[PDB]
């Protein structure tokens, strides 16, 4: 019933990530908080 991800698993997923940010997320960030957006 419990879904867990330890530190190494999460960091490895970041280090090997290649997929881009979903466009819906990017547009939402731009809409409500453009000033914190990094790209």
């Amino acid at each position: 019933h419990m879904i867990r991800y330890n530190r190494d698993t999460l960091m490895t997923a970041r280090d090997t990530k290649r997929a881009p940010i979903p466009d819906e997320m990017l547009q939402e960030i731009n809409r409500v908080a453009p000033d914190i957006l990094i790209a």
């Binding site: 879904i3 530190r7 940010i21 997320m25 960030i29 409500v32 957006l37 990094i38």
Partner: protein
Amino acid sequence: TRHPLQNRWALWYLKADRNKEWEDCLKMVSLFDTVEDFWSLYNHIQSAGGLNWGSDYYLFKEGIKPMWEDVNNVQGGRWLVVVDKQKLQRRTQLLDHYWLELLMAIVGEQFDEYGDYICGAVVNVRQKGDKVSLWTRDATRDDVNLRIGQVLKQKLSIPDTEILRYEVHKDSSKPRICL
């Protein structure tokens, strides 16, 4: 690829604006519920260490408003970590270490069997000392909050020397636990 998270989380952002009230500066930036979307979000926004003085980030479970008056927070409290000893880049680096380690511990459900009692995390970026806090649901559960505090200190490598305070939200309107 898809690694679903136990919980769906909302990131909130408090934009420093000296002319406006708290409620008018706060924005729900994005919800996410996978490891992929967690990192997409974190990768494309300013780190805690890159925010202007006076800004906040909040990460709370979907449905929990990032305010102590929320039914999910009202009977609860927070573990508080103050980042004020180091200077300039070293302080900034420690702040970012604490925030991201905390976020990873939360979304990865690393707080043993007590994840149901986690509400969210808050970072306040302040010139006088940044604050990183872990909010829990029930301030009467010493067993829960003590264990959560121990994991918190372990994950963030907070030394036994530095004593963390668990403060009850209600009393803020003297720590219940020190660690």
